[PDB]
Amino acid sequence: GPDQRAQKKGDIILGGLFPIHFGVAAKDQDLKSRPESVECIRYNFRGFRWLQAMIFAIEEINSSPALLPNLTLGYRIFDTCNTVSKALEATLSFVAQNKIDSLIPSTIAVVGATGSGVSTAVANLLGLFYIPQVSYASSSRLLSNKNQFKSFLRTIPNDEHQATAMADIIEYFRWNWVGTIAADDDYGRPGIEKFREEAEERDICIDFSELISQYSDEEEIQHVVEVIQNSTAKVIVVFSSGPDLEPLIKEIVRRNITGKIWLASEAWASSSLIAMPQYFHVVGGTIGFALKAGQIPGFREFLKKVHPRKSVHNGFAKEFWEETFNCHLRPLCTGDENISSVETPYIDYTHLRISYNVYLAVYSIAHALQDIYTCLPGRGLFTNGSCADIKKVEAWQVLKHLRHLNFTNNMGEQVTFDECGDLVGNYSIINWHLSPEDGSIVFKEVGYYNVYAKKGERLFINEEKILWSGFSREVPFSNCSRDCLAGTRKGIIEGEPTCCFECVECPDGEYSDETDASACNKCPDDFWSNENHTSCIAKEIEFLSWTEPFGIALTLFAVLGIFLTAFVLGVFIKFRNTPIVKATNRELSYLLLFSLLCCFSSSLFFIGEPQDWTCRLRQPAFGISFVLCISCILVKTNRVLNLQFLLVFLCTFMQIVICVIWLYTAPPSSYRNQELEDEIIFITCHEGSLMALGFLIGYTCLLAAICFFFAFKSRKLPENFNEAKFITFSMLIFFIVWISFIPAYASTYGKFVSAVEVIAILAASFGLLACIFFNKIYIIL
Amino acid sequence: GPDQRAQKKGDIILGGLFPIHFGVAAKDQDLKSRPESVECIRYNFRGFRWLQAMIFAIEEINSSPALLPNLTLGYRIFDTCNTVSKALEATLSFVAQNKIDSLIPSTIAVVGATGSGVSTAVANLLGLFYIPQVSYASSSRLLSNKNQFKSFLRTIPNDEHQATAMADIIEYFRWNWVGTIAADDDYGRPGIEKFREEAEERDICIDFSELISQYSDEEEIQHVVEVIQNSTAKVIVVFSSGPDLEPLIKEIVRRNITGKIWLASEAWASSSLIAMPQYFHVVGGTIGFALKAGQIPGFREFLKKVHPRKSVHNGFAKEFWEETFNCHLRPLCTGDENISSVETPYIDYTHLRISYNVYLAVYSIAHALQDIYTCLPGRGLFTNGSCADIKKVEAWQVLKHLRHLNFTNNMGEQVTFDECGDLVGNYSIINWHLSPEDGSIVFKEVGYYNVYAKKGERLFINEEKILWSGFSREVPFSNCSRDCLAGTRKGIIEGEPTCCFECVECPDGEYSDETDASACNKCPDDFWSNENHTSCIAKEIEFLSWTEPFGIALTLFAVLGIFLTAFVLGVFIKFRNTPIVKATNRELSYLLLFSLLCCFSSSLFFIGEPQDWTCRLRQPAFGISFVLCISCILVKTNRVLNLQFLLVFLCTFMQIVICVIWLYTAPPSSYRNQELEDEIIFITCHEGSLMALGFLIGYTCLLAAICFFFAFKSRKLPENFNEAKFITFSMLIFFIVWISFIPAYASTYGKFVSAVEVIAILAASFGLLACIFFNKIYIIL
Ligand SMILES: *[C@@H]1O[C@H](CO)[C@@H](O[C@@H]2O[C@H](CO)[C@@H](O)[C@H](O)[C@H]2NC(C)=O)[C@H](O)[C@H]1NC(C)=O
Ligand SMILES: *[C@@H]1O[C@H](CO)[C@@H](O[C@@H]2O[C@H](CO)[C@@H](O)[C@H](O)[C@H]2NC(C)=O)[C@H](O)[C@H]1NC(C)=O
Ligand SMILES: *[C@@H]1O[C@H](CO)[C@@H](O[C@@H]2O[C@H](CO)[C@@H](O)[C@H](O)[C@H]2NC(C)=O)[C@H](O)[C@H]1NC(C)=O
Ligand SMILES: *[C@@H]1O[C@H](CO)[C@@H](O[C@@H]2O[C@H](CO)[C@@H](O)[C@H](O)[C@H]2NC(C)=O)[C@H](O)[C@H]1NC(C)=O
Ligand SMILES: CC(C)CCC[C@@H](C)[C@H]1CC[C@H]2[C@@H]3CC=C4C[C@@H](O)CC[C@]4(C)[C@H]3CC[C@]12C
Ligand SMILES: CC(C)CCC[C@@H](C)[C@H]1CC[C@H]2[C@@H]3CC=C4C[C@@H](O)CC[C@]4(C)[C@H]3CC[C@]12C
Ligand SMILES: CC(C)CCC[C@@H](C)[C@H]1CC[C@H]2[C@@H]3CC=C4C[C@@H](O)CC[C@]4(C)[C@H]3CC[C@]12C
Ligand SMILES: CC(C)CCC[C@@H](C)[C@H]1CC[C@H]2[C@@H]3CC=C4C[C@@H](O)CC[C@]4(C)[C@H]3CC[C@]12C
Ligand SMILES: CC(C)CCC[C@@H](C)[C@H]1CC[C@H]2[C@@H]3CC=C4C[C@@H](O)CC[C@]4(C)[C@H]3CC[C@]12C
Ligand SMILES: CC(C)CCC[C@@H](C)[C@H]1CC[C@H]2[C@@H]3CC=C4C[C@@H](O)CC[C@]4(C)[C@H]3CC[C@]12C
Ligand SMILES: CC(C)CCC[C@@H](C)[C@H]1CC[C@H]2[C@@H]3CC=C4C[C@@H](O)CC[C@]4(C)[C@H]3CC[C@]12C
Ligand SMILES: COc1cccc([C@@H](C)NCCCc2ccccc2Cl)c1
Ligand SMILES: COc1cccc([C@@H](C)NCCCc2ccccc2Cl)c1
Ligand SMILES: O=C(O)[C@@H]1Cc2c([nH]c3ccccc23)CN1
Ligand SMILES: O=C(O)[C@@H]1Cc2c([nH]c3ccccc23)CN1
Ligand SMILES: *[C@@H]1O[C@H](CO)[C@@H](O)[C@H](O)[C@H]1NC(C)=O
Ligand SMILES: *[C@@H]1O[C@H](CO)[C@@H](O)[C@H](O)[C@H]1NC(C)=O
Ligand SMILES: *[C@@H]1O[C@H](CO)[C@@H](O)[C@H](O)[C@H]1NC(C)=O
Ligand SMILES: *[C@@H]1O[C@H](CO)[C@@H](O)[C@H](O)[C@H]1NC(C)=O
Ligand SMILES: *[C@@H]1O[C@H](CO)[C@@H](O)[C@H](O)[C@H]1NC(C)=O
Ligand SMILES: *[C@@H]1O[C@H](CO)[C@@H](O)[C@H](O)[C@H]1NC(C)=O
Ligand SMILES: [Ca+2]
Ligand SMILES: [Ca+2]
Ligand SMILES: [Ca+2]
Ligand SMILES: [Ca+2]
Ligand SMILES: [Ca+2]
Ligand SMILES: [Ca+2]
Ligand SMILES: [Ca+2]
Ligand SMILES: [Ca+2]
């Protein structure tokens, strides 16, 4: 394989795949000359630390007598440069003896790779030969498919939980308008698809979805930047690694776009390529995910013991030395430099997360080998309970024992792989802060995601520790439309997702008391809308009331009429012996005064809240009383022109028969009219039979016409102090009053119709009383 | 490599990857023993025809002297079984000489593979060594990435156009509620993502998105089936191959789900695994995509010449013979059977689409080799214009010449590969019909998709040829919500996409004239909504018009009053010498009659449409005329009790000063009241100065009260035929009329206030005229 390698000899050989370089020289091969091996350029100190973690774990296993006694573990580790081609050359180097026996030391297991696409490409070849491959950083769900990848296992948790956690985070901060960026590889696309599913099931709308790569052209990056700028959303979920996101972040920094709230996947939430101070105005305040940190005692000293000459087995130490001190072995370096003197990710780390994954992968392979070594003859996992010979062990046997692995960590936790080869683990939630002393970016832990917890309780966040955009304490607004107040209702904007709405105020008569009201709820039948439609208020019920001032005035006038009638009646009764009261029919005078009292009592009926009996006894009472009084006047005129009682009885009986008829057929009834005024309910009365009202007033006015005619025929005659002209005057007053209020009765449907009726009754009764009796009162004085 | 192979020797060797089997055995090893090579189960006759197409193209090239003279093409073709593992074993067989020179005949180029995931896995290894790989059926966009796949080219069009075409088809048939199913591989996921993008830009809502596979468990298939059933959407877009869709179709057939409209991607739109008659109730009427058919003259005869013994180079002919006739060489077969006797996809084909792609790939490699062979010494593609030695040709040189390929087909078309190695091509659109004679499924061409055409013109469909569900001629309904009629407006349903809406009728005063009205438009102030709210009609304007019957009646009474006043005036002028008219002031009588004429003319003012001058000259005219009348009556009474003209002038001048004052300060104006009734606009008049109106009526009624008082003081006195009582009567009639209509003026704001005012004016004028002059007329007779 490649010349640059870390090789050690042993009984069992472990393969190693690490990204010692971030990527390869970006150039299009001309194919004019024979193509040579591409050279990867940017040194990755963190990847070299991962390689050192693998070597340290192997050395610790070799030193420990408890684990794999009398057996020596060796390694063959190559640099992938985050590239499929280099990893495939290394894998072809691994499977040389398998290829010879299908178409150099034998490779029992392989550790790696980092990238999910690289791991998929390597896993195809490795599972072709059933060589177990335990990856430390590849987290794509596509690798969980065991039909495709038979020998692939993971010490890193699967990516589905991370997308669910991002959806939970967006829900927690109450956002529904977000953008998505994904790396165009096996890491970005499945994760972003899972996030899209989880966001749509949480009613979260995604404005844009874009794909990026480290090989994206200038036009693609410009298009993505334009899409980001053109959007209102400021929360962008990014599923990518450092190298695949670096060009986009660089272009955003050049254009200097600030205000975006970045949600970071684990691959770049701790990336040194993205977390640099000069990008902090763009990427500051980023909220991202980190793996659970682990402890590897003695690892730091082993890292500090690195040396070009002393590390003879590790061939990558040469370039690490040359890149750390910028020397060559460009100034020549003696080799006596100090690692602690230079600040690189190699030593400048706080938590071991992927390095712990490498350590766990190596120890998992070692524990599988130990389970093979300690297998009791009749209790094996293979056919008939047989056990593999550790001296002549085969890769498929180690894979079989890895599928059944259960071992305790140095941290006292149980490591197991499921049917998909996944190792579930918690997440920590970090926020990108700026250091005051140094100015570098500090990853402050602000929360966690508990995968073991049930749905809805997995997320915990300390929002007080969060600095939005790196400096702000207020949660930013990332909704498409403002949640407008009550009294309004949401409405569709064509061609736009449901999260974006225009809210129109409620229609008159409909109320909305809730923010984000889908529709304006209607008020009930007896209620109406508020002034701003933020509530519902009872409809005002209106009629002619007793306590209201005008009803009081009408009642006082009715009582005054009753008092005057009683006064005249008392004057007549106490002084019945005088010739003046003897001239007129004093019995008929008493009956007429009683009729006037009944008339005023009937006038009292119209005032007040309408009721069934009240509307049933308003027209009939006045009709009876006024027919009776006109009949008494009629018999007085006929005397002027026993039997008089018979005539008044005949008239009152005809009128009361009419009344009984139309009260038996169709009683008047109280009804709550609601169509005249929307806000106001009019309590009024249905007559029931309108032709009955015609008959009633026709009879009253016909008896009136007869009385007026007979009084006119004898107007000039002086008798009983010429009462004929007074009768004529009272009756013409009756006709003036009742004709004059026809405009009043016409179309004035409200609380004032009862007032008009009361005033008409009072006027007619007062005119009759005055004309009949006030002349006699003047005579008596 | 694998023992079962098709091998021929030659100077230049072409690799071959074909799916002779549909898959592998479902033997998921428990790793009890050493895992053996997996056995392939279901024979694929169409894949064997593709392999025969490759062999036929190679043989035709060898026979043709024009193409590659004195050079013999050989092949090494293996069976992939649509599996990554076996394809990778074959690819490792291809790259043996490369692996020997990086860590058996040399492979110059490889044809294949079919599946996109298989092609990706093979292309990683092949591009590691820059061995050109021309695929005939893998259409994933992921393979267009030349950073990852350096040596990969395609004779099949890329899948982006097909997803765009499906979006265009959904738009054409007016659907917005569709479901999506995709194979969980490199073919299904990118295509379904492209379709999701193209549908979201076209306002198409996707109810569900599911993933399937040939290895999907029972629970996954049941979940997908329940998702399909639970959905209202009837159109389902499927990006999958036959084997990956077969379990889902089988389960849907078991449950007998009918009514769905399947949109088929090219991989399964012509699949024999899905297009079987016993599934026609479920998959009948499917609309799918096919590639351009090609012509390979002599191919059918070569296919019919297949034989186990005679085809010594083709090792796959043995199992083809055994599967075709169900024999062994299970009854023994002599080998003298006839291919045409048995109906298999091998010969029972109508159009060569993938076989033509295989043929084109072989001729593309051959033409690249020919371009190498005919290279002029100083005009090469390589360094310094050098040309490759065809005798010692290398794979990377052939790849370089393939990247620059221009050659003419046997059909007379130009074959070229772009920078991504893609060959663009048209699509045909087919519909799954049922044959009447045979009962098999017939793929009827119903349209095409022209990739060369501009956007919006690429799709052509003959809907008359389409049988929906296999039997129906009516386009099915696949919208989430009914597009309800006009008069209604759409409204949001919470938690649901914009395509699903509840439409509420428009509010009163608002109209929607369009289907799918986003909001109800309020039409202008003079308009009010229709009863259906489909439009809005003009607001009715209400006033007291001349043509109205009641306005006509009022005009007739006014004209009658004018006629009566003129008659009295004529009687007075013609007979001025009589003693009766000499007794009264004849000049004052003429003035009073003229004032009555002015009063009737003022009564005529209120009738008609209000106008600024009309509302300005309504109250003043009547006020001045009636005060002049009362002043003449006043001087007549004062005579009853020169200077009379002075008194009438004083009174009329006081009132005219009041009038000039309040028409100078604030004149009355015509206004269109729109608040009393929503549907109707009342045209009425603002007085302007209400206190000035108080002054006007106060002065008129005060001059009245003075006249009434003075006439009452001299009521009994007989003079001028005792005109005093008649004056008192006219004046009391004035007071009765004007007091009586106070209820009428109160709150009766409409077209009837002018009517009431006209009636009051007519009544007062008639009373005055009658009382003053009709007694004199009676005396004159
Ligand atoms: C942004 O929009 C979301 C969704 O409408 C709002 O979240 C809602 O908040 C209210 C009150 O807290 C809850 O009753 C709803 O259930 C939430 N809807 C969800 C979770 O879908 C959020 O408040 C908005 N943020 C703003 C306007 O700043
Ligand atoms: C994953 O995270 C959860 C929550 O942080 C851990 O549960 C906590 O465990 C500690 C002790 O280890 C308790 O004091 C807390 O009360 C627990 N919190 C809960 C249950 O909400 C859990 O142990 C973590 N798992 C791993 C494997 O680290
Ligand atoms: C289903 O809904 C779609 C909405 O997209 C309707 O298609 C629209 O029809 C109107 C007709 O006036 C066109 O103006 C729009 O341009 C169409 N929208 C498109 C094509 O996206 C379709 O008519 C509905 N089908 C029904 C109700 O059967
Ligand atoms: C793709 O399809 C279009 C339309 O079917 C083809 O254009 C047609 O070409 C024929 C001649 O070959 C003309 O008679 C038609 O009028 C054309 N139709 C158009 C322009 O709409 C086009 O040639 C096809 N491209 C191929 C086969 O490569
Ligand atoms: C009550 C409303 C609806 C109808 C009005 C009825 C009026 C117009 C009718 C009914 C009674 C009638 C009067 C009955 C008696 C007399 C006396 C007679 O010597 C002259 C006619 C005269 C003066 C009539 C005039 C018209 C009259 C007053
Ligand atoms: C509309 C109603 C309520 C109010 C009308 C009041 C009327 C009906 C009353 C009030 C004053 C009354 C007048 C008082 C004086 C006279 C003069 C006398 O020689 C004949 C009766 C006559 C003419 C009365 C007729 C009726 C009269 C005008
Ligand atoms: C002077 C002559 C006409 C006799 C007087 C009769 C008067 C008192 C009565 C008889 C008929 C009545 C009219 C009948 C119709 C209406 C329409 C109504 O919506 C308003 C009142 C109004 C306009 C009335 C006004 C007064 C009226 C004209
Ligand atoms: C109709 C409503 C508005 C008012 C009713 C009061 C009127 C009609 C009543 C109350 C007092 C009555 C007056 C009492 C005294 C006299 C004096 C007598 O020599 C002529 C009748 C006359 C003048 C009466 C006319 C009618 C009269 C004025
Ligand atoms: C229409 C507005 C002005 C209200 C009407 C006011 C009425 C109630 C006033 C104004 C003119 C007044 C009359 C003026 C003249 C007389 C004659 C006198 O010997 C007795 C009082 C009497 C009969 C007054 C009665 C009340 C009266 C009619
Ligand atoms: C009843 C006798 C003693 C007096 C008669 C006066 C009459 C003709 C006049 C004077 C004041 C007038 C009232 C003034 C106020 C209103 C309120 C209005 O919305 C309806 C008409 C109504 C109810 C009028 C009814 C008739 C009325 C009472
Ligand atoms: C104008 C509306 C109110 C209709 C009322 C008509 C009144 C105002 C007019 C019309 C005809 C007139 C009558 C004509 C004839 C006479 C006879 C005379 O000896 C007494 C006056 C008297 C009785 C007049 C009274 C007023 C009168 C009745
Ligand atoms: C005239 O003498 C009367 C005899 C009986 C009753 C009454 C009064 C109490 N009712 C006025 C009924 C009101 C009215 C008038 C005209 C048209 C419709 C309507 Cl609803 C008067
Ligand atoms: C009474 O003698 C008059 C002198 C001048 C004018 C008039 C008439 C033409 N105007 C009625 C004005 C109507 C009215 C009455 C009371 C309250 C409000 C309103 Cl709006 C009469
Ligand atoms: O699967 C993948 O592609 C990513 C690669 C990756 C992860 N975390 C990282 C940290 C540093 C460098 C690389 C990574 C998570 N899985
Ligand atoms: O890339 C892929 O996976 C599919 C495989 C495929 C296509 N068309 C076919 C016809 C028959 C059999 C298989 C196929 C289109 N591309
Ligand atoms: C974004 O808006 C700018 C300004 O008009 C425009 O130039 C650019 O094309 C837009 N991009 C997209 C993706 O709409
Ligand atoms: C970038 O934008 C910020 C505004 O947030 C501004 O303070 C800063 O000066 C800008 N930097 C450059 C180089 O323009
Ligand atoms: C591993 O062993 C522990 C006991 O030390 C046990 O609790 C745990 O369940 C085991 N793991 C599995 C997967 O059985
Ligand atoms: C379909 O709907 C039924 C009824 O609500 C429910 O029980 C079932 O779980 C649903 N299935 C799916 C796949 O959503
Ligand atoms: C399957 O469905 C079709 C169409 O609805 C119907 O004709 C047929 O009888 C059904 N068969 C069974 C077994 O339900
Ligand atoms: C291929 O050659 C033809 C002429 O034979 C020419 O028209 C066409 O443009 C060429 N294609 C390319 C890609 O150069
Ligand atoms: Ca790696
Ligand atoms: Ca050891
Ligand atoms: Ca990184
Ligand atoms: Ca949209
Ligand atoms: Ca294949
Ligand atoms: Ca030849
Ligand atoms: Ca198929
Ligand atoms: Ca939803």
Q: Is the dihedral of CA A112, A115, A119, A121 positive or negative?
A: negative
CB contact under 8 A, B747 and A744: no
Interior CA angle at A238 toward A235 and A243, to 5°? 140
Cis geometry, peptide bond prior to residue B113 (ω within 30 degrees of 0): yes
Residue with tokens 């009742």: A738
In angstroms, the Cα distances linking A692 to A683, B14, B540 are: 22, 112, 35
Measured in Å, how far apart are chain A's first and last C-alpha atoms?
Answer: 144
Residue from B624, B617, B616, B622 nearest B651 by CA: B624
Whether A669 and A567 map to the same domain: the answer is: yes
| H helix or E strand, kind and range, residue B547 | none
Q: Least CB-CB distance to A492: which of B35, B399, B498?
A: B498
| DSSP for residue A211 | E
Amino acid, single-letter form, for residue A714: S
Cα A227 from Cα A207, distance rounded (Å):
10
One-letter amino acid at A715 equals R
Compute the distance between CA of residue A13 and CA of residue A15 in angstroms, rounded to an integer.
7
Tell me, yes or no, whether A318 and A457 share the same domain: no
- DSSP-derived secondary structure for B57-94: HHHHHHH-SSSSTT--EEEEEEE-TT-HHHHHHHHHHH
Phi, psi of A629 (to 5 degrees): -65, -40
The answer to whether residue B180 sits within a structural domain is no
The answer to whether A78 touches A363, Cβ cutoff 8 Å, is no
Q: How far apart are CA A707 and CA A635, in angstroms?
A: 9
Query: Burial, B728: exposed, middle or buried (Cβ in 10 Å; 0-12, 13-18, 19+)?
Result: buried
> If we measure between CA atoms, which residue out of B400, B316, B286, B283 comes closest to residue B49?
B316
Class of residue A518 by CB neighbours under 10 A (exposed 0-12, middle 13-18, buried 19+): middle
The answer to whether A40 and A79 are in contact (CB under 8 A) is yes
Rounded Cα gap, residues A371 and B461, in angstroms? 66
Q: Does the CB atom of residue B452 touch ligand 4 within 6 A?
A: yes
- Rounded to whole angstroms, how far apart are CA atoms B726 and B711? 9
Q: Which residues of B touch A82 (CB under 8 A)?
A: none
B415, B433, B465 - which closes a domain: B415
The dihedral sign for the CA sequence B544, B546, B550, B555: positive
Residues of chain A numbered 59-118 and touching chain B (CB < 8 Å)? 84-85, 88-89, 92-93, 96, 99, 102-104, 117
Exposure string for A643-675, b = 16+ CB within 10 A, e = fewer: ebeeebeebbeebbebbeebbeeeebebeeeee
Q: Look at chain B and report how many structural domains it folds into.
A: 2
Q: Is the CB of A755 under 6 A from ligand 10?
A: yes
Place of tokens 């990118």: B190
Q: Where are the beta strands (DSSP E) in B331-420?
A: 407-408, 414-415
d(C-alpha A121, C-alpha B718), whole Å: 135
User: Rounded CA gap, B247 and B250, in Å?
Assistant: 5
Pairing mode, strands A427-434 and A287-291: antiparallel
Residues A322 and A435 grouped into a single domain = no
Same domain, A686 and A729: yes
- For residue A126, the number of C-alpha atoms closer than 13 Å in the C-beta half-sphere is 38
The 3-state DSSP class for residue B665 equals helix
Query: What residue has token string 């009624």?
Result: B701
Element (H, E) at B541: strand B540-542
Q: Cis omega (within 30 of 0) on the bond before A264?
A: no
Question: In Å, how far are A423, A649, B102, B433 from A19, measured between CA atoms?
Answer: 22, 123, 21, 55
User: Are A336 and A250 contained in the same domain?
Assistant: no
Same structural domain, A408 and A445: no
Whole-angstrom distance, CA of residue A57 vs CA of residue A233? 46
Q: What are A502's two structure tokens?
A: 């225009």
Burial A714-749 (b: 16+ CB within 10 A, else e): beeeeebeebbbbbbbbbbbbebbbebbebbeeebe
Token digits of residue A110: 């392989």
Which conformational region is residue B439 in: left (phi greater than 0), alpha (psi within -120 to 50 degrees), or beta? left
**Residue B153: in which H helix or E strand, if any?**
strand B152-154
**Pair B411, B554 in one domain:** no
Residues in contact with B592: Cβ distance below 8 Å, sequence separation at least 6, in sequence order: B628, B629, B632, B633, B772
d(CA B28, CA B228): 30
- A278 and A381 both lie in a single domain: no
Residue B213: inside a domain, yes or no? no
Q: Does A736 touch chain B (CB under 8 A)?
A: yes
Residues 6+ apart with CB under 8 A from A696: A619, A620, A623, A655, A658, A659, A662
Q: Which two tokens stand for residue B597?
A: 């004429």
Is residue B587 classed exposed, middle or buried when 0-12, 13-18 and 19+ CB atoms within 10 A define those classes?
Answer: exposed
3-class DSSP string for B713-768: HCCCCCCCCCHHHHHHHHHHHHHHHHHHCHHHHCCCCCCHHHHHHHHHHHHHHHHH
Residue A681 and residue A560 share a domain = yes
In-domain check, residue B463 = no
What resolution in angstrom units was achieved for this structure? 2.7
Contact A492 B504 (CB under 8 A): no
Answer positive or negative: Cα dihedral of B415, B416, B417, B423.
Answer: negative
Alpha-carbon gap, residue A398 to A132, rounded angstroms = 7
What are the angstrom distances between the C-alpha of B122 and each of A124, B115, B359, B663?
10, 10, 20, 101
Work out the end-to-end distance of chain B between its first and last CA atoms, rounded to an integer number of angstroms. Answer: 144
For residues A76 and B709, what is the distance between their CA atoms, to the nearest angstrom?
A: 134
Are the C-beta atoms of A71 and A369 separated by less than 8 Å? Answer: yes
The DSSP secondary-structure symbol of A43 reads B
| Contact criterion met (CB < 8 Å) for B746 and A756 | no
B362, B383, B415 — which closes off a domain?
A: B415
The size of chain B, in residues, is 781
Residues B56, B305: Cα–Cα separation, whole Å: 11
Secondary structure (H, E, C), B264-298:
ECCCCCCCCCCCCHHHHHHHCCCEEEEECCECCCC
Which ranges in B286-382 belong to alpha helices (H)? 299-304, 317-325, 354-373
Note whether A59 and A203 are same-domain residues: no
Residue B160 class from Cβ within 10 Å (0-12 exposed, 13-18 middle, 19+ buried)?
buried
- Same domain? For A455 and A386 the reply is no
CATH number of domain containing A244: 3.40.50.2300
Distance CA A598, CA A582 (A): 24
Sorted by sequence, the CB contacts under 8 Å of residue B333 that are 6+ apart come out as B321, B322, B325, B327
A 299-358 residues with CB < 8 A to B:
none
Q: Are A259 and A286 in contact (CB under 8 A)?
A: no
Nearest atom in ligand 9 to B732's CA: 28
Task: Tell me if A131 is assigned to some domain.
Answer: yes
- State the alpha helices, DSSP H only, in B579-618: 579-583, 586-606, 612-616
Q: Which two tokens stand for residue B93?
A: 């067989």
DSSP-assigned letters across all residues of A327-384: -B---B--S---GGGS--TTT--S-BSHHHHHHHHHHHHHHHHHHHHT--TTS-SSGG
For chain A, helix, strand, coil in percent to 5 are 45, 15, 40
Strands B441-449 and B427-434: antiparallel
In angstroms, the Cα distances linking A532 to A505, A515, A537, A572, B505 are 8, 14, 11, 65, 22
Task: Report the interhelical angle of A116-128 vs B116-128 (nearest 10°).
Answer: 90
Backbone angles phi, psi at A93, to 5 degrees: -65, -40
Asked if A412 and A556 sit in the same domain, the reply is no
- Specify burial of residue A384 (Cβ count, 10 A radius: 0-12, 13-18, 19+): exposed
Please report whether residue B85 resides in a domain.
yes
Residue type, B532: N
Q: Is A548 helix (H, G, I), strand (E, B) or coil?
A: coil
- B531 within some domain: no
Q: Are strands B12-18 and B73-79 parallel, antiparallel or unpaired?
A: parallel
Method: cryo-EM
Angle formed at CA B523 by CA B519 and CA B527, multiple of 5 degrees = 145
Distance in Å, CA A229 to ligand 1 centroid: 24
Domain-embedded: residue A122 = yes
Query: Does A511 fall in a domain?
Result: no
Domain boundary among B384, B415, B446: B415
CA distance B143 to B136: 13
Domain enclosing residue B76, as ranges? 5-157+295-415
Question: Which pair of structure tokens corresponds to residue A182?
Answer: 């994904």
User: In this structure, are residues A144 and A410 in contact, taking their beta carbons and an 8 Å threshold?
Assistant: no
Over its C-alpha atoms, chain B yields an Rg (Å, rounded) of 52
| DSSP at A526 | T
Give the CATH number, domain containing residue A667.
1.20.1070.10
Q: Name the minimum distance, in Å, from the CA of B597 to any CA of chain A.
A: 25
Whether B558 contacts B603, CB under 8 Å: yes
